Every structure is written in C-alpha cells, then in structure tokens.
Design a protein around this ligand. Structure first.
Ligand SMILES: O=C(Nc1ccc2c3c(cccc13)CC2)c1ccc(F)cc1
Ligand SMILES: O=C(Nc1ccc2c3c(cccc13)CC2)c1ccc(F)cc1
Ligand SMILES: O=C(Nc1ccc2c3c(cccc13)CC2)c1ccc(F)cc1
Ligand SMILES: O=C(Nc1ccc2c3c(cccc13)CC2)c1ccc(F)cc1
Lengths: 143, 337, 337, 143, 337, 337, 143, 143
C-alpha cells in the first residue's frame, strides 16, 4: 500500500545512490559490499535481468516495487522446491533426516549458519520427528 | 601477502592436481617434452644419427629432469595447502601415497643416470610415460568397460581361441611336409595368430591347395571373431563415458538444489536496512530459482520420465482428494435432501 | 554330521555346476592349468626344446588327468544331491546326458594315452578346451546373435562374396600372363580372399598397372564389406547381453513380489504371544515392502513407462468414477431444484 | 489406547529381555528363535532400520508402539501390492488363476502353508471364480 | 482335382516366389549346388586337378542346367496363377519383366555352352550367383543404408582420400631415390592404398628413417579413417533392419484392427438358430479382441508413448468435461442460493 | 529482363553456394573432372605411359583451369547479389574472405604453371582437392566428433601407445642379436607400429620363439586397442549427424509456428469484398494449421515427451482449478446448510 | 432371465450334440460347418479358452450362459476399438472416409459383405458426412 | 443465418466465376491474383483438400458455406497455438518479449505488416508488459 510504497521508496533511495531512479550494477555492488557479501560482475548482471523487466541494464523504481510486490505464492516456485527436495531425497521415502538437512545446508550452496537451520527445523519439522517431509515444508513456506 | 600466498598455493595445487583449462595446456606441453625426449632417445639408439641425437638428448633430458624435480617439489609444497595435509608432517604423510613413491623413485633414477645405461634410460622413460596419467582415469575406464562387457568379451575370446587352435592344427595337418613353413605345430600356431588377427606377415602362408581351402574356410570366421572385441570395447567406452557425464549432470543438479532451498528459506524468514535486506534476499531467491530450473535439464529420456512421474504421483494424490470431496458431496446429497 | 554332509554335497555341486564367485576362481585355475598343458605340448612339438618340454609335460598332464578324474567323480557324486537324481540309479541316469559322455570319453582317452600319439594328444587337448564351457553359453549367445542379425549378416556375406569373385576374376584377366602369381583363377581367388580380408600375405599381389587400378577400385569396397560383420556381431552381442540382463532383472522383480504378497496377507490376517506374533509379522511386512519397492528399479525407459501407464489406466478409471459422480450431481440439480 | 498401550508394554517386555527399554538385535534374534525362524545378522539389521526411527541400533519402546500404531491404510502400500500383482499377471487380464496363486505362494518368497493360501482364496476370491482380481484383494486388505 | 491343382500351383508359386520356411531350405540347397559347381570350376582351372575336376563338373553342370530350366518353366507356370497374369498371354506378359530376361538369357547361355569357353563359363556362373537374390533385397538394403549415412560416409571418403594422397606424396618425396620401391608417384600411391587399408602386402615399404617417421605419423590417422566406414555401415544395417521390423510389426497391427472392428460390428448388429448365430458371433468377437490386444505389443518406447498419449488426450477431453460440469455447478450455486 | 537477371544471379549464387539438388550433380561432375586430371597426372609420372598421359593431361588441365576461372568469376559476380555485398566494392569486400584467397591463389598458380614443375602440379592439385569442400563441413564434423569423444579417444591413444612401446622394447630385448631385423630399438618400434595397426608389412617379424610368444601376448591387446578408435569415431559420426538432423527438424518446426500464429491472428482480426477476404484468410488459417501440425512430428522419444509434458502441466493447472472449485463447494455446503 | 435361460439351454442343446452338457471342440467344429465357416483346430482351441472359464477343454453350460450374459459394455472393449480406429486413422483427423471404411472392411480381416458395411455406415455415420469419427461409433456400439 | 447465407452466396458467386457452383483451382487462382498474392498449383490443391469435404477437386457452395460456418472455437486449434507459442518461448518463462513478437512476425512465415503486429500487441498484450503470455493470447483469440 501507500505506506509500503513509501518504504520501498526509502529502500530504493538507499539503493540508487546516483539518485536517477535506477539501481546501476555499481550501486548494487556497493550496497552488497555494505552487506559484506562478494558479488561478481556476471552474477550481478544475471541478478539485474532476473529482477529487471525492461532490460535496460538498471532497475527502475517501479520494477523494484513490483519485485517487492511479488509474494512467494505468486512466485510459482512450488514445483521447483518439490524437485529440489526430491533430489535430496535419495530413498524416495517422502522425508529426509534432520541430520541430512543440517549436513546439506552446511555443505552445499549458500551455506547457512546454525541459527538458520535450527529455525528451519523448528518451522518445517512441526512433527519434530527429524524426518521433514517436503510437502509440509513447501506448503508452510507458500502458506 | 599471506592471503595472496595461500591463494597462489591453492591455485597451483589445483593446476598440478585435477586441472580444468590451461593447466591441461601445461600438462600437454610437459607430455610433449617427455615425448620429444623419448623420440630423441630412439634416434640415439640408431648408429648413424648417434652424435647429434645424443647431443640434443643431453640438454633435453637435463631440461626434463629439472622440470620433473621442480614439479615434484611444487606438488609437495601444494599438498600442504589441502586440509588433509598441512605443515611439515602433513606433506610427508601425503608423500606416503604410492603414486608419490613411483614418481620419486623415477626422479632419483633419472638423477642417478644423470650423474648399458640405455636400457635403464628406456625403463625410466617408460615409467615417466606411465606417470603422466596421475589419476588412473584411463586404466579405470578400461577396466570398468571390460568388466561391464565381460560376457561378450569372454565369448569372443573363447570362440576365437578355439577357432585359432582348430584352424592351426588342421592346416598343420594339411601342410605338414609340403610346405617348409609348417614343419612344426608351433609354426602353424604362429601363422594362425598372425592371420586371424589380419596382420598377415607373409613369412608363413599355406601353399597346398587343400591347405589353402581350409585356411580360407577358417580365416573368414576367425578374422570376424578376432575383430569383434575392438567394436565391443568401443561401444563400452562410449557407454561408460556417457554414464559418467550423466552422473556429473546429476551432481550439478544436486548443488543448485541446496542453493535454492537455502535461499527460499532465507526469503521466507526475512519478512531502510530491513527492507534492503529483504530485497537482496528475495533477489537472491529468484536468481537461485532460475539457476536451479536451468539446472533441471532432462539430458535423458529417463530423467524427464522421472521428473514427470513425480508430478503424476502428485496428480494421483490430488485426484484421490477430489474423489474424497465428491464422495462427501454424494453423502451430503441424501442428508440435505 | 549327515546334515553337514548334505550341505557340503550341495555347495560342492553348485560350485561345480553353475558357480557364482570363488568357484569361478577355481574354474579359472583349472583352465589355466589345462592351458599350460597345451602350451607345453606346443613347445614339446618343437625339436630343440623337446627334452625339457616333455619332462615338464609328463608331470603336468599327470596332474591334469588326476584333476579331471577327481572332478568327474565329484560331479557324479554331486548329481545325486539334486532331487532329479538320487541314490545309485539316479547318478547313472544323470550321466546318460551327452555332455557327461563327452567328458568321460575325454577322460578315458587321456588315461589310454597315459598308460603318432602327438595327434591324439592334440585332439584330446582340444576336446578338453571345448569341455571347459559346460553350458554352451558362449555358443548359445553366438548363435542367438547370428540368428537375430541374419539379414544384415546375409547381406554382408552375399555382397562381399560377389565383390571377391568379381574382383578376383577381373584381376586374373588383367594379370593372366604378366604376373606369374595369377597363372590360374584359383590363385586369383586366393589373392582376393587374403586381400579383401586385409590379411595381405604378400605372396601374390598385382603388378600390371591396370591390374593395380582394378585391385584398388575393388579392394576399397571389398575390405569395407568384409569388415562389416565384425561390427555387426559386436552390436548383436551387446544387445543380447543387455536383453539377458533385463530378463534377470525382471525375475529378481518376480520373486520379491511373491514375498511382499505373502507377507502382506500374513500381516492382514494376524490381527503376549499373540501381540509378539503380530509385531514380528508386520515387521516382516515393512521389510518385504521395502525390499520389493527397491526391486522396482526401472532399469529401462520402457519399464518405467509400463509402471506409469498402469497408474495412468488407474487414473482413467478414477476419472470415469468422477464423471459418474458429477453426472449424478447434475441429474440431482433439476431434481432437487 | 491405554489398554493397547499396556498390551504393547507386555509385548516389549517379552521382547526387550535386557529390560533397558530397547530391543537389541540379539534380543530380536532370541525371540525369533523362540518363533523357530532363522534370521541373519544383515537381515535383522535391515529389520531394525526399517522399524527404527532413531537409528540408534535398537528399538526403543515408543518406536515399537508407533509401529504397532501403524495400520495398513497408513502403510501406504496400495501401489506396491498393485505392482506385485501386476508382475504376477502376465496376460494383463486383470485377474489371476487360483491355481496360479497356489503355485506362486507355494514356490516363491516366504512360502505359505496350505491353510494360508486357502484362507487367502476365501477372503480375496469373494466371487469364487478362481480368478482373483488385484483390485478386490488390495481393497479388502486395506479396507 | 482342379481345386487341388490350383492350390498346388499357388503353393509352388509362393515357394518359388517370396518363401517363408522350408522353401528357404530348397533355395539354400540350390545355392549350395551352384556354389559347388563354381568351386569345381575353380579346381578345373588348375592344371594338375583338371581331369577329375572336369569329370565331376560335367555332371554337376548338367544337373545345374536341368534344375535351372525346370525352375524357369515352373516359375512361368506359377505366374499364371496370380491374378496379375493368367492364361497364355499373362505368363508372357509377366516374362516381360527384366529379371525374367536376365534369368532366361543365363539359361540360354548355359545351354549354348552345354551343346576359351572357360571365360564364358565364369561369366555365366557369376550371373547365376547374382540371380540367386531374385528380389534385390540385399542391394536395396545396402543402398538405403548408404543413402541414410551419406554425410558420414562422404566425410570418411573425403578425409581418408586426402590423407592417402598427402601421405603418399610426402613419403614419395622422402623416398624418391633411396628406396627403389617409390621410384614413381604411382608406386607411392599404391603403397599408401595398401597400407592405409591395413592390407600391407609388403612389396613396397618405406626404408629411409625420415620416410618411416612420416609413414607412421600418417598411417595412424589413415588406417583409422579407412576403417571408419565399416563400422558406419554396420550401424546403418542394424538400424535399417530394425526399422523394417518395426514397419512389419505395424502392419501386423493393422490387420487385426480390421478383424476386431468387423467382428465388433457383427456382434453389435446380431442382437435356436438365431441364438446360435449370436453366440458364435460374440465368440468370434472375444477371440478377435484378444488377438488384437495381443497384437498391440509396444515393441518400442515411442510406440507405447503414442498409445498412452492418445489416452492422455482423451483424459484432457474428460477433464474439460468435468471443468464444464463444475462451472455449471458454480453458476447454479448463486442461482439456487 | 532486369528482374529475370536478378533471379538468375541469385539462383546461380545458390547453386555455387549451398546447393540442394542438381547443383550437387554439377559439383560431382567438376569433382570427377579434377579427379580425372589427378589420375592422369599420376599416370604421366610413370615413364612408359608418359607420352599419351601428358597428351591427354594437357587438354584436361586446360579444361580444368578454364572451368575454375569461370567459376571464380561467376562466384564473384554472384556475391554481389547477396545484400551483404553489392555493387563494385561489395564483391571485393567479400573476396577478402580467406577461402577466396586460397581459391584465387590456386587459380594463379595453375595459370602460372600453364603459361621440376611436377611437384608444383601435385601441390596445386592437392590444394584444389581440398578446395572442393567450400564449407569445412567434413572437417567441422570430424573435429566436433573428436572433441565429443575426447575421453575415449585419449584412453585408446594412451593405452595403445604404452602397449606399443612396451611390446616393442620387450621384443627388441628378446631379439636383440638373434634376428637381424631388430638390431636397433627404432627397428623394433617400426615393427610394433606396423603390427599393432595390423598392417604387417613382413619386412620385420620376430623369429626367436620367446620373442614370438611375447609378440603374440602383446599383439592381441595391441591390435584391439589400435582398432578401437575406428569404431569410436564411427559411433561419434552417427551421433553427430543424428543431432544435426534433429536441429534441422526443430528449425523446420520453428518456421511453421510463425506461419500459424500470423495466419491465426489474421483470421481472428478479419471478422462481397470483405466476405471474400475473410474466406481466403480463414482458408489460409486451416492450411497453415495443417502444415504446422504435420510439422509437429515427434522424430524422437524426448520430443514427444516434451510435447506431452506441456499438456501434463496444463492438466496440473486444470486439476488445481477443479480443486479450487470443489473447495468452494465444500465451503458452501455448511454455509447453505 | 428365465426365458433367456431357456433360450440359452436350447442353444446349448443345439451345440452340445453329445448332450453331456459340454461343447467339445468337435461339436463346435460340426456346428460351425453347419454355418459353413472353416475353423482350424488351433483357432478353435483358442476360442474355447477365450470362452472357457474352467479350462477343462470344453464349454459347460453355465460358462456358455455367462458368455451370453456378458454384454458389450461389460466386455470393456472401448479402449481396443479406440486403438483399432486410431490405427486406421493415418492422418489423426479424428475421422476416416467412408471410402476408407468400405476398402478396409472389404480387404482386411474377416471381410464383410456390402450389406454389413452399408448398415455400419447407416448406424455410425449418423451425420452422413462420409467421415465417421471413432468416438461416435464406439459410443453408439457400447450405448 | 439466411442473411449470412445470402452473403456467402454473393461471396461464392464472386469466387465461382464459371458459375457452376464449384470454385475450380483456376477460379481460386484468379481471385487470389485479384488479391495480389502469388499461389502455386500444389499449394492451391492443398488448399482445396483442406477446405473440400467431397474431394471432387472443387469447392461446392455447401462446403464453402460450412467453412464459413466453422468458428475458431470449432476449429479446435488451441493445442496447436499452444505448441507454436511454446516453440517460440525458448526459456519457458510462460511469456515472450514484445520485441520477440515483432521480430518473429516480421522475419518468419507470412510476414505481417507493422499495423498487424501493433494490433496484435494491443489485443493480446492487455497487461501492456511487453511479455505476452500464450494463455491470454489463445483464450482471447478463441473467446
Ligand atoms: O580382447 C582383447 N584381446 C583379444 C582380442 C581378440 C581375441 C582375443 C583372444 C584371447 C585373448 C585376448 C583377445 C582370442 C581372440 C583385449 C583384452 C584387454 C584389453 F585391455 C583390450 C583388448
Ligand atoms: O560373418 C562371418 N564370416 C564372414 C565375414 C565376412 C564375409 C563372409 C563372407 C562369406 C561367409 C562368411 C563371412 C563374405 C564376406 C561369421 C560367421 C560365423 C561366425 F560365428 C562369426 C563370423
Ligand atoms: O566406404 C566404402 N569404401 C571406402 C572405404 C574407405 C575409404 C574409401 C575412400 C574412397 C572411396 C571409398 C572408400 C577413402 C577411404 C564403401 C562404399 C560402397 C559400399 F557398398 C561399401 C563400402
Ligand atoms: O585415433 C586416431 N589415430 C590413432 C589410432 C590408434 C592409436 C593412436 C595412437 C596415438 C595417436 C593416434 C592414434 C595409439 C593407438 C585418429 C586421430 C585423428 C583423426 F582425425 C582420426 C583418427
């Protein structure tokens, strides 16, 4: 809403240091440096085209707002998370050991700190059985 | 400086160890250099070309031995970078590995010859040639393919062996005295082997017309059988390399799955520092989702079949749900009417 | 003791008969021993090496004959274990089988030579070599592959045969007098056969330039055609072994299906001795279900296609049910409104 | 319920001879010997992991109770029995001769005594036609 | 009698024309007889064996010519049975076909030689050998495979041709004077052809060491390329025969489809002579349904995919129907509430 | 006239450039002519046939050079037709392309020799032969296949190379003095290369019996390995050509998709000049729809799998819609009752 | 019903000439000869097993009655006729020319006389367009 | 209706210059020349068989009227347009850039003038995002 729109304007101003209303790749790099993460030029460009709808090389404010207006249910990513968890579920039991979750989050992709995996276990492992099914995880994440 | 030193050490380690690109170029150059050393040694073994051959070979083997020594030192220095082996004791503990032993004994043999030697030089050059693999990849592939096709290969071996023996004995009988080539059974076996393999030296060949007829009748089938294993191994090699590619594709699938799940959890849990954090997090989410879905390339009919059958089972669950709901409506019908 | 004796008898039977593991090792060792006997006989046939060759061959063939005799006795003793043949008459009735006849006549021939003999020794060694299969597996595979690819093999045979005859006749015409090699058509045919098979002994080769040109023009296509059947047979062997593996997989599927159905029936019907019985029964049920579902590995695109099409037909039945229910609701609509 | 829980406690006490609340592989072997069946170490271990949810190498009492709390419809084995019977149905007629049932139970897997196959024919072959369809067998078994 | 005469005529026609079983046995026997005639002629061409060879060949060629004449007469008599050709004029109109011309001119040539003749005998025997196909099946398959793999075959031809020419010229330069074998470029080309094809007669081989090195460097790649087309043709033959089998399977599907549809229509329309008629009709219906469903064997992944996708489209239609019904219920909801 | 001139120019361009049909016939004729020139040159190199060979070769090379010159002029004239190059400067800018350079320098060399020359003639003929491709298609295919199967080819190379070296050295040791053939290691290597490749010249062959045994033991495996790459390359060629065919099929799919979408939009938007326009438009619509659906031939299991999985995802969306509607009905149930 | 049962008894009596209550293969052959059609031994045996439920080599009267009690919708042959017509529909248009129908019935399988194909066109080609869809044919045949 | 039938009669009279009630291939060629498009004999024959139901080589007026009586929803072309747009959607995003639309209509098949692609963008690109989904295009075109 209008309050959310103003919050997004503040976020964009923090992003678009140039102030031209577009977040250039350099501005994104500087802000991410502020976050301490290390981006590359190619990955950043991929980022822009993923979030850019005009393909102008920058992120104009309405595109940014629309991205912030895109909710997870609108993402239409249920199938992708289904497939990811299936990939991790070798046996096809429908679940996966919490030890397997800790191992895979801590040794693959963007490694997650212990706090993150603990909270994931809390929210997803509602049954507290150590074997978190993908159905429950994705439905809770989307709903 | 120290961080740069570690980054160097590790990049150099990877180049020496499992390489990807221009490290293959360096390995090709060192292989070419050792190959040039070998061919120059071969020429040196000739009598006429001995002078110039040895003159060039001296400097070339000097270069080869210094390169091998520096490469060994660099490899040991690199092994200290990997967490399995660090510091002083770690590098030695790595060097305990048998391939380190073969490499180092090759080095010391080359130095010893440096500071009847032709036979030792040939042996050390052959050992170096073997050393150029460093991973047993070629041998592993060959052995795996042979084991996979053990039945067909054994069929070819047994049948061709019987054919060779039978044809050789029959020809020997048909040419015991007429042809001086086959005065003994061993000569006949030599002939059979050099023909059925299609080598056909020409030192021994049948001359009695009945012997010639038997030789024809058996050489047809014999050459066919002796040629079989070449094609069998070719097919096996193709299949095995395809299988390795499939496994590599599946691992490249496994990693982005972790990336996507992690980023999706972060995006879910992150709901103007805070707004900026959520923006970057969701941004990462879309990027990782795109990377993963791209990584979900079928690459194979069975792969797409699996991915679609998962959805088909999901469909079965959903149609069970709809059956439950329609049954509820049917039960309500009479209840409300 | 008696139970141990029966267990031995049967394990020994299986080792001698269809073996799995280290029984293959024993079979490999006996094959190696007979092969050593054969090569030593080959050396004995040489004149210079006759003394030492025969000296070693005497003891080696003694060992071979005693091993073959004891193995024959053990095989007969083992046949009494299988229910098809037991007691005294059963073992003889088993020995009526033709392979028993070939083996035993080989044994008696070896004993007779033991207690111009070189030719008989060669014949008996070849017969022993043939005997090493004991199942016709190699011959069965070869014949099956040939029958499967009868059309392509016959195409290659006919075309290569015509090419050989035509090229041989043409060269013979082009080299009737100029080259003494081709004084007769039979010599030309011999040349054609030894070239098109790429053996190329070198005893006969064209020399007239026009003859050389014809030889080139025909040898290209001839060698291609003569090489065809090797690759054809290689592909056939691979396909047939793959088919046998598929059938074995399906049998390994068939057995756990029986296991699962039996255990599921027991678990259903078994509903603190009684509680313990039901616990163990359901425990077996989950174990057998897991074993079977593991046994349901696709192994092939067609296999997964079949397993999924069964579910798809089930889906069709379910959607028919839902169509019936929706039709009922539609018919009720006007009825209640 | 509480009565069922007490019955399960009695069963476990008969199982966990050590009395530590966990049925070790040795205890399972001894009880099965009491039943007269012959287990192997590997098959017994597979058994434990199939029924063990903690993977501790033994069966704690609540895991055992949950196993006894797992009913056939909760097993989710309808598809597996479908596939098994399909495997046995070579012609794909939708049925299978009662003679085929007797033969296959008596010559494959854990061979069943004549009484068992007779009662299976009684319950499943409700139509008494000798050709038992798999649909009816599995639906009766689950329902 | 007359009906028996027609049945004979037609069975004999089919045996002579496209045969199935023991007719192949008769064809094999006639092929074996002509092959024996050819080999006996080859022996006759030898000087020593001329007497006995010609003595046997006279009677064998008498038998061959009488058999060929009677088979020609029988074929003409048979062509009158097929509706395309009947009576007197029909058989001649059939004989207008070119294969009839080749066969008959072979017959008259054989008779003329019967009542320098060696060359004519060889020509007529080769023509007979060609005649043994009678359908061009082998030639058709070979040509089809070559056309299918025209690109790979042309690649192999061009590359191997360039390799041969280049290697031959380079060796000729390296051995212009030193080796008397390569005094001219034509000799070098002959050497290159006989090596790259792996025939290696041995009449010409390089001797200058630099020439030997060039010969090695080029023969590796040359022999690889010259061997390529053999394997390419093998794969092509396998693929084409598989395709013919698939087409035959689909025709064997087409016929029972007609049977089933006809019998189903009869069963539908036939609803105690009348009861007996309906009983036999429905009986035929189940039989034909079983025959057809058996004929619906996938035989291929694509086949089952097609059969299942038809049902999937049917599913799409049904789910559209259910969407329509649920939309009707949704529209009724507010209307009735 | 001018339009006819442009149509000619362009048809001629396409014939000279990427051709389809009878343009291949013309290219085959020019290739045959240059091949005849080459063979006549080969004959001229012979001493006896020099007179007639050169007499015919003079006129044949005159024809070849004039044909090549006119073809070059026509190609340049044609390049002006394509929009990339028009007018005066465009044709030269096209001629800047390297293949134009090779062709033109071949032309000027041929003219210069026209107006020790045998070596230059051979070089120019080889260059012309290379020129006959004009697209690198054969070379591109070969390189692509080699790169695709780099691992198996490298395995074969390394293993066969080691086998050759080891066998050669061992035989050399076993025949250092007894056989004059192997007086030096280089001779042994030459023998190993000519045997393992199955060429078997016969100039050098082992004679010491122990040397013969080593030669056998190593030649078995060596010939197998040296034959491997032929079959590997054959399979690679088949696979790559199949892939190109698949890509061509997909492009032929891409174009009618555009046609269908355009015609469907026109038909939708066009809703008795006006009635006639709509009639022709919808007529085009059905025609284009038929063309496209025909173009949707699976051609491959994966293709049909993709086309069906698209519909399956559509099915998933539809079943989600039906789940939503049934949930709405369930929620209404209590609300209205 | 009882009247239908009596009609079936009459039919069986006309069939089971031996009168033992089972139609032996010889009796079937004789009756079919009465119909003038030419059966073979193997095809007749296949016939029996298709219609025989006991597999005794003959058709006992209750099996025959059940066959007569089996109606087309109970045959469950919709899919088979679907596939047959699909096989005949090369283009996949959903229809097939009436000329194609005449040709295929008159030159494949158990050839049908002109009257049969005409009546098939009448009943199935309700639209009278010459292109008879398989949907309409099979639904009319079953319903 | 009757008015539409009379309009179709006028259209056919403009088509069937011979006036025999059938539009011969020559008449179709002449009218298309009037439209200025260039047809070939084979393509025209294909046209006739596509629109001809009798296969007589000409289009009788009832067939022409039926063609004009065939509406797009009756065409049953939804799947074909689905597949075409899928072919054009390389990435599988569910949409396609308006630039891609302009490019593909202007460089493939029967090239469309700028006006046509503009109006296509107007009607299909209802959201005005440049990325036109195929779902919306086909549903609007059919509905
Ligand atoms: O098959 C291989 N080598 C034979 C080829 C052909 C034949 C044989 C026989 C006996 C033993 C061997 C082979 C009889 C006919 C072969 C082995 C190992 C390897 F690495 C590469 C190739
Ligand atoms: O194809 C086999 N052997 C021929 C290869 C090549 C050719 C032939 C010809 C006639 C008869 C035979 C063969 C003409 C060209 C072959 C047979 C039996 C077997 F067990 C393994 C191989
Ligand atoms: O590929 C065939 N024959 C060549 C094999 C190998 C090579 C060639 C070359 C030129 C012309 C020909 C062939 C260069 C290298 C071949 C043709 C026809 C046929 F029926 C069976 C086989
Ligand atoms: O594989 C090719 N050529 C060898 C075949 C066999 C062997 C080799 C070795 C070393 C180097 C080469 C080859 C050892 C055994 C080959 C290369 C290029 C090409 F275009 C066509 C064929």
């Amino acid at each position: 809403t209008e309050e959310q729109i103003a919050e997004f304007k503040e976020a964009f101003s923090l992003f678009d240091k140039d102030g031209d209303g577009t977040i250039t790749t350099k501005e994104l790099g500087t802000v991410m440096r502020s976050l301490g993460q290390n981006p590359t030029e190619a990955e950043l460009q991929d980022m822009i085209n993923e979030v850019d709808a005009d393909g102008n090389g920058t992120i104009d404010f309405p595109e940014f707002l629309t991205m912030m207006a895109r909710k997870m249910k609108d993402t239409d990513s249920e199938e992708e998370i289904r497939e990811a968890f299936r990939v991790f579920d070798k046996d096809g039991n429908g679940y996966i050991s919490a030890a397997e979750l800790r191992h895979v989050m801590t040794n693959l992709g963007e490694k997650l700190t212990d706090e993150e995996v603990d909270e994931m276990i809390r929210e997803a492992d509602i049954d507290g059985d150590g074997q978190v099914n993908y159905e429950e995880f994705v439905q809770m994440m989307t709903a | 400086r120290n961080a740069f030193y570690r980054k160097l050490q590790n990049f150099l380690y990877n180049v020496l160890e499992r390489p990807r690109g221009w490290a293959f170029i360096y390995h090709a150059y060192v292989f070419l250099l050792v190959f040039s050393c070998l061919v120059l040694s071969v020429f040196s073994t000739i009598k006429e070309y001995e002078k110039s051959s040895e003159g060039a070979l001296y400097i070339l083997e000097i270069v080869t031995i210094v390169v091998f020594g520096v490469e060994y030192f660099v490899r040991i220095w690199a092994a200290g970078c990997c967490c399995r082996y660090r510091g002083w004791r770690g590098r030695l503990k790595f060097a305990r590995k048998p391939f380190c032993v073969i490499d180092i004994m090759v080095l010391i043999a080359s130095i010893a010859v440096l500071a009847s030697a032709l036979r030792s030089l040939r042996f050390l050059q052959i050992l170096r040639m073997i050393r150029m693999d460093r991973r047993g990849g070629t041998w592993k592939l060959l052995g795996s393919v042979v084991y996979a096709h053990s039945k067909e290969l054994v069929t070819a071996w047994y049948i061709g062996f019987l054919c060779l023996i039978l044809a050789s004995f029959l020809v020997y009988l048909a040419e015991k005295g007429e042809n001086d080539h086959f005065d003994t059974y061993a000569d006949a076996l030599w002939w059979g082997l050099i023909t059925l393999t299609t080598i056909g030296y020409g030192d021994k060949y049948p001359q009695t017309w009945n012997g010639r007829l038997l030789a024809a009748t058996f050489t047809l089938i014999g050459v066919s059988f002796f040629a079989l294993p070449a094609g069998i191994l070719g097919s096996g090699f193709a299949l095995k390399v395809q299988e390795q590619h499939r496994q590599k594709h599946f691992e490249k699938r496994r990693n982005p799955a972790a990336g996507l799940i992690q980023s999706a959890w972060r995006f879910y849990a992150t709901n103007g520092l805070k707004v900026s954090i959520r923006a970057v997090c969701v941004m990462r989410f879309l990027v990782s989702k795109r990377k993963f879905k791209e990584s979900l390339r079928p690459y194979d009919v069975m792969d797409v079949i699996e991915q679609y059958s998962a959805g088909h089972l999901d469909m079965l669950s959903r149609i069970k749900s709809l059956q439950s709901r329609v049954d509820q409506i049917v039960g309500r019908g009479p209840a409300i009417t």
